[PDB]
Amino acid sequence: IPTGQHVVCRPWNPEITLPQDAEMLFRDDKFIAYRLV
């Protein structure tokens, strides 16, 4: 994880709601990956 950033994964949720400070990385069948910047 790049310094100052935080990568977070959550249980798969097609309707996942992320903050404006988040960027989407990818969506899996098990979990969804995003990072805070």
Cβ-based neighbours of 4, under 8 Å, separated by 6 or more: 37
Experimental method: NMR
What's the CA gap between 37 and 23, in Å, rounded?
7
Output b/e per residue, 4-13; b: 16+ Cβ within 10 A. eeeeeeeeee
Q: Regarding beta strands 6-11 and 22-27, do their DSSP bridges make them parallel or antiparallel, or are they unpaired?
A: unpaired
What's the CA gap between 5 and 15, in Å, rounded?
23
Identify the CA nearest to 17 among candidates 8, 29, 4.
8
Identify the CA nearest to 35 among candidates 4, 6, 1.
6
